[PDB]
Design a protein around this ligand. Sequence first.
Ligand SMILES: NC(=O)C1=CN([C@@H]2O[C@H](COP(=O)(O)OP(=O)(O)OC[C@H]3O[C@@H](n4cnc5c(N)ncnc54)[C@H](OP(=O)(O)O)[C@@H]3O)[C@@H](O)[C@H]2O)C=CC1
Ligand SMILES: NC(=O)C1=CN([C@@H]2O[C@H](COP(=O)(O)OP(=O)(O)OC[C@H]3O[C@@H](n4cnc5c(N)ncnc54)[C@H](OP(=O)(O)O)[C@@H]3O)[C@@H](O)[C@H]2O)C=CC1
Ligand SMILES: Cc1cn(C(=O)c2c(-c3c(Cl)cc(Cl)cc3Cl)noc2C(C)(C)F)c2cccc(/C=C/C(=O)O)c12
Ligand SMILES: Cc1cn(C(=O)c2c(-c3c(Cl)cc(Cl)cc3Cl)noc2C(C)(C)F)c2cccc(/C=C/C(=O)O)c12
Lengths: 406, 408
Amino acid sequence: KKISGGSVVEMQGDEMTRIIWELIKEKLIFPYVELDLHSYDLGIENRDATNDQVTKDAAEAIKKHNVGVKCATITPDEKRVEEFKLKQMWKSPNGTIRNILGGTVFREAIICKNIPRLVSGWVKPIIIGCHAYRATDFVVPGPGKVEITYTPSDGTQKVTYLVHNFEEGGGVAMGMYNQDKSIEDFAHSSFQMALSKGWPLYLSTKNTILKKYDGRFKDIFQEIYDKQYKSQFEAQKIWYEHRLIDDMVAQAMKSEGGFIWACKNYDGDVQSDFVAQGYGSLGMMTSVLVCPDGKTVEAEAAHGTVTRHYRMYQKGQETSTNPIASIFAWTRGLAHRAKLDNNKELAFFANALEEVSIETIEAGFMTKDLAACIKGLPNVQRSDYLNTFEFMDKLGENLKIKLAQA
Amino acid sequence: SKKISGGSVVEMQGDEMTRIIWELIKEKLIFPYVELDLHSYDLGIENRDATNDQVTKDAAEAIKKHNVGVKCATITPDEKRVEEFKLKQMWKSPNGTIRNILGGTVFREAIICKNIPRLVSGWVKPIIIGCHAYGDQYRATDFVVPGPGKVEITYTPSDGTQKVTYLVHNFEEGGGVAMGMYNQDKSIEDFAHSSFQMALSKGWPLYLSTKNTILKKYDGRFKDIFQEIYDKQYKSQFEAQKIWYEHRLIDDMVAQAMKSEGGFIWACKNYDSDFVAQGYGSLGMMTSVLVCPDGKTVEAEAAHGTVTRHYRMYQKGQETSTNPIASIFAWTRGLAHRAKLDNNKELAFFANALEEVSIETIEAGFMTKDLAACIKGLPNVQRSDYLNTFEFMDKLGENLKIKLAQAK
Ligand SMILES: NC(=O)C1=CN([C@@H]2O[C@H](COP(=O)(O)OP(=O)(O)OC[C@H]3O[C@@H](n4cnc5c(N)ncnc54)[C@H](OP(=O)(O)O)[C@@H]3O)[C@@H](O)[C@H]2O)C=CC1
Ligand SMILES: NC(=O)C1=CN([C@@H]2O[C@H](COP(=O)(O)OP(=O)(O)OC[C@H]3O[C@@H](n4cnc5c(N)ncnc54)[C@H](OP(=O)(O)O)[C@@H]3O)[C@@H](O)[C@H]2O)C=CC1
Ligand SMILES: Cc1cn(C(=O)c2c(-c3c(Cl)cc(Cl)cc3Cl)noc2C(C)(C)F)c2cccc(/C=C/C(=O)O)c12
Ligand SMILES: Cc1cn(C(=O)c2c(-c3c(Cl)cc(Cl)cc3Cl)noc2C(C)(C)F)c2cccc(/C=C/C(=O)O)c12
C-alpha cells in the first residue's frame, strides 16, 4: 500500500507551472503517497471568482497545518486585467501569504555533477535568505521641505529629521520602515537554518552608509546569536559573522560554498532570482519560507509560471520546461512534514525523489535549459535534451525503479 | 614637429601605487608622442590636507573650464587614514567633491582581452554601466524608532500654503528603524542627458533599469523624465545611428543583459555595486568616466583604488606587478575626448592606438600578475607567467613605438 503522508496544504497555480504541477502529482507523488490534502486553487480565474478569498484561506491553512507547497501564480498587472477581464488588480498571492505567515524566504540552487554553477569554485550548496516593498513614495511638486517625524505613542517629545530642502525645483521622496520584531524573526530563522543544515551563517549589510537602519540588523543579529545560539553553533563547529556587503561578495566568490547568507538589501537591488534567470539556472532554484517558530514552512519553486513557455504550448510548439524546482517544493514540504510527524517512510520518499531528480540529470537526461547551461544555447541540438513530457516520463520511470528497491 | 599637439588637459595626481604608475604612463607612453597644455593639480593626501582640501575644488573648477580631466586614484580618508597621516580633518572623498561640482554621471566599463574570460561567457561586445550617484542611499536620513509611535513623512512647499503628511508606519508594538530618501528632478534630468550623450558617443542602445513596479512614484519619475527628454531631444539622433532607448524593470534587465551579446549602455538606479569584478577577475581592467550633462565635459579615471597593498611592497623594495591598464585608459579616454572637441584627428588616432597596443600586448601573453591569475588561477602563477610593473610598462612602450611607426 501507499505511504501515509499526513496533513499538507497545496496551492494550485497558473499557466505552464499549473501543467507541470499536475504532472508532478499524478506521476511522482500520488502513486506513492496518500495525503490529507488541504488543497486550494490559486489559479487566476478562481482568485477572481472568490474575490481573492481563496488566497487568504490558503495562508490561514498553512499556518494551521504548518506545511504548504505552492505552485507559481499570476500576479495581475494592467495587461492581465485585460487578458482575464479581472474585477480588479488583485495583489500578489505571495505577498498576501508572506504577510500573513511572516518568516524568511530561503533560496537554494540544486546542484548536479554535470551542471556548472555560477562560480566554478563552489562545491557545497549556498542558501540565501534575503529580507526583501512596504514603502510610501510620492512626487515633490516643487521647492519645499520634506521631513520625516516620529511621534511617540506615550506622549513624549515628537522628533523631526530633515530629509531635504528642495531649494530649486522638485523631484521625489519616500519613507521606509522596519520593525525590530521583523528583524528578530529574520535573525531566528537564519540561525535555525544554519544549525538545521549545519553550515556557518553570514549576514551582509551596508551599515557604513545606513549606519542606523542597517546597524539595527547587525546589532539584533549579534545579540540573538550571542545569547541564544552561539553555544549551539560552536557545538556544531560552525559560526556566525557579520560582513559588509562589499566584502561578502568577494568572500563568497572565493569560497567553496557551504554557508547560509542572510542578506539585507534595498528594495531595488539585484536579486539572486534575476541572475539565476540570466545564467539559465532558475528552473533549478528552490525557495522555502521559514517562519521564526521553526514549525511552519511554505515551499515553492523560485521561478514564476513560465508564461513564455506556456504561450509556446498554446501555439502547438514543443516545450522543455524544467520541473525540478517545483519537484523540490514537494520534497521539501514533505520532508518537513516527515520531520514534524516523525514519519521515517515519508522522509525516505522525499530524499529518494530528490536523488532521482539529480541522478536523472547527471545521467544525461535533462530539459533544454540545463543543456544550454552546459554547452551554451547556440550549440544546443534537439538530441541534447528532452521535452517537458519526455522528461517527466523519465523521472517517473526512474522513481519507480528507485522505490522498487525497498 | 614629431609630437602631436594635444591641447588643454587638466591632470590630477594621486596617491600610493597609482601615483607611481601615473608618472610611468606619462613619461613612457604619453609625453614622448604628445605635447599638451597640461594643467596639473596634486590631489595626494599631503597636498589635500595641506590646502584644507582646496586643491580638489580648484582641480574640479579647472575641469569645468577646459572640459577634459584625467585623475589618478586618491585615498578617501577614514579613521585609520586620519591616524596614518595625522590629518587635520577626515576629508570628504575627492571623487564626490568633483562629482558634486561638475554633476553628471559615472560610467564604468571593463576592457576586454580575448584571453581574459568575462563575467558572462556569451558577452562579445563591451557593456557600459552608468548608475545614479546622487541622493538615494548615499544621501539618506535613517533613524532608530525606540518604541510604539507614528512615523510620518511630510512635504511643505516653500510658499508654505500647503502641508502634506504621509504615514510611513504606525509602530503598534515595539520599535524599529525608518528612513527618508529623496532625489531632485535636476539630478534625474542630468542623469538622462548624460546617458543619452553616452549612448550617442558609443553608438549603442540605451536601457534605463528601475524598480517602478514597487516605487511607482519614486522610480516612475526616472522613467518619465528619461522618456520625455529622449522624445524631445534625442530620438531623432538615436534613429540616425540605428540605435534606440528602452526602459526595463531591473528584474528583466539583469536577465536580458546576461543573455545578450553586449554592446549596450546600461543606465542604472542603484549605487548606495559593480564590485564583483574584485572577486571575479581584476579591477585593473575596469575604467570609469564622469560624463557631464552638457556632453562637452568629462573626467576619466581608473575605477580601482590606490592599491595600497602594492605600495607597501614597493616602499620596502620587493618587486610588484600592478596593472596599469585602467590608468592608461583614463588618459586615452580623456585624450579621445579632447580630440573630439578639437577635431584633432592625430590625437584621436594616438588615443585609439595606445588602447589597441595595451589590449594586444596582453592578448599576446605579456601581462601583470593579476591577469595571469585570472587565467591560471592565483595558486598556479609562476614568476614567469607575468611581467612586473616596470617590465610591463616597458613592453607597452616597445609595442607602442612599433604601432605608431606603421601609420605616421
Ligand atoms: N512565486 C510566484 O508565484 C511567482 C510568480 N511569477 C509570475 O510568473 C509569471 C511569468 O513571469 P516571468 O517574468 O516570466 O517569470 P518566470 O520565472 O516565470 O520567467 C520565466 C522565464 O525564465 C526562464 N525560466 C523560469 N523558470 C523556468 C523553468 N522551470 N524552466 C525553464 N526556464 C525557466 C525561462 O527563460 P527563457 O524564456 O529564456 O526560456 C522563462 O522565459 C508572471 O505572471 C509573474 O507574476 C513570477 C515570479 C514568482
Ligand atoms: N576612485 C578612487 O580614487 C578610489 C580610491 N580608493 C582608495 O584606494 C585605497 C585602497 O582601497 P582598496 O579597498 O584596497 O581598493 P583597491 O582597488 O586599491 O584595492 C583592492 C585590491 O584589488 C587588487 N587590485 C585592485 N586594483 C589593482 C591593480 N590595478 N593591479 C593589481 N591589483 C589590483 C589588489 O589586491 P590583491 O593584492 O589581492 O591583488 C588591491 O589591494 C583606499 O585609500 C581607498 O579609499 C578606493 C576606491 C576608488
Ligand atoms: C550564491 C548566489 C549568490 N547570488 C547573487 O545574486 C549574489 C552575488 C553574486 C555572486 Cl556571490 C557571484 C556572482 Cl558570479 C554574481 C553575484 Cl550577483 N552577490 O550577492 C548576491 C546576492 C544579491 C543574492 F546577495 C546568486 C545569484 C544567482 C544564483 C546563485 C547560485 C548559487 C549556486 O549555484 O549555488 C547565487
Ligand atoms: C555588465 C556588468 C554588470 N555588472 C553588475 O554588477 C550587475 C549585474 C550582474 C550581471 Cl549582468 C551579471 C552577473 Cl554574473 C552578476 C551581476 Cl551582479 N546585474 O546588474 C548589475 C548592475 C551593476 C547594473 F547593477 C557587472 C559587474 C562586473 C563586471 C561587469 C562586466 C564585465 C565585462 O563586460 O567583462 C558587469
